[model samples]
Target: PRNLSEWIKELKKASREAVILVEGKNDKKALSKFSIKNVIDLSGKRYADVVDMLEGKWEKVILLFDLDTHGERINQKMKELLSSQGFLVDENFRNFLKKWNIIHIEEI
Candidate 1:
């Protein structure tokens, strides 16, 4: 991937196999611009609540939160919560965004 368009294409391909988790609707909407589906937004809900919702249906998830203090906190928190619940929290996509210095998912 040489550019964001290519990166988004990569993300689209990767997203097909797992649920991409975001912080809110705006973030989900941002990914939608690239035609990336399979996203679920936390939307101010508790981590446990969201985990409960994902319990049986999904086993793999990618946490695509914003690169900020709040997002960081939630990312770790959600990681622990999800891991304890047996969800395979894939961090590769999140790390890819961080490596490219993208701050908000909406920025993508």
Candidate 2:
């Protein structure tokens, strides 16, 4: 939270055991550089398609969408969908972004 290294450390801890949901390729690319696993890009696909794809795969999902209008939309929609399907949606990573004032994962 204080810096990229600290933030990346937190990300590694939180995301190592969960499925990370971001907005697109850039987001995924950024996180991938840190060797975080199980990241999913939510762009260019229907929400339902992503929901279906996640079925039976992982139960813990964390959202790292950007702090913007479109990101907020995806956050709510995906949270609802994943929850209804019995996935435990995690918000700690998103809170980390807010606490650190990060607008884009790609920027990190």
Candidate 3:
């Protein structure tokens, strides 16, 4: 696959307030290393809080949780909440992240 830098640049260009939703601190650290700000820490917060926090705030959101089992559950829960609120959730982006093993930015 091509380098992720290009994709990251494009994402950054498309959205000014891109909120990256992750599982824990480690993931946040990784994204920070990649110069990705505007992250939402979903470590201890309730699932609904994610929705509330992101509601009417960010024009685009990238949920970059892990690719593991727990990540799947949280991703689904997030998608449901976003959909319920009439937000355009990108399943393709989630699937692409899963495929590229970019679940945790710090892991890269």
Candidate 4:
């Protein structure tokens, strides 16, 4: 898990065509506070719906959901959906998310 500052630094280095997938509106607001403009919020949409919406739309997509059970499930579902639809999913990011257990960055 990255601290807020580290996350901000990463967001700054991301490319303009890079789009980040976050769980909800709160995460979207938080990322926006750090100037991460290229974010996709999955607040009300189904996982497949979000995948369909972003298919072939961006050069890069990063899934930055929480590292919890529900997050894990959603991550897997989203990846499978994207792959089935011929979208390029980032396996490295998915692996990193699985390896790390982050309750909350500040709490850790």
Residue-level lDDT tens digits of model 3 in 4-102 = 776666555543546667788887777667666667778899887877887787655677667788888888888777778767665554566677777
- In model 2, state the lDDT of residue 79: 90
Residue-level lDDT tens digits of model 2 in 10-92: 87887767788899988898888888867889888888887787788777888889988888888988898889988999987
CA lDDT of every candidate: 0.87, 0.84, 0.70, 0.64
Summing lDDT over every window of 10 consecutive residues in candidate 2, give the lowest-scoring window.
50-59
After superposition, the stretches of candidate 4 with alpha carbons farther than 4 Å from their true spots are 1-7, 91-101, 104-108
The 10-residue segment with the lowest total lDDT in model 1: 1-10
Score candidate 3 by lDDT.
Answer: 0.70
TM-score of each: 0.90, 0.88, 0.79, 0.72
Instruction: Give the C-alpha lDDT of model 2.
Output: 0.84
Among residues 3 or more apart in sequence or in different chains, the pairs in candidate 3 whose N, CA or C atoms overlap within 3 Å are none
Runs with alpha carbons beyond 4 Å of true place in candidate 2: 1-3
Model 4 pairs whose backbones collide:
none
lDDT string for model 1 (31-71, tens) is: 88888978989977877878888888888988888889999
lDDT of 4 at 38: 82
Q: Among these predicted structures, which one has the highest lDDT?
A: 1
Alpha-carbon RMSD to native, per candidate:
1.4, 1.6, 2.3, 3.4
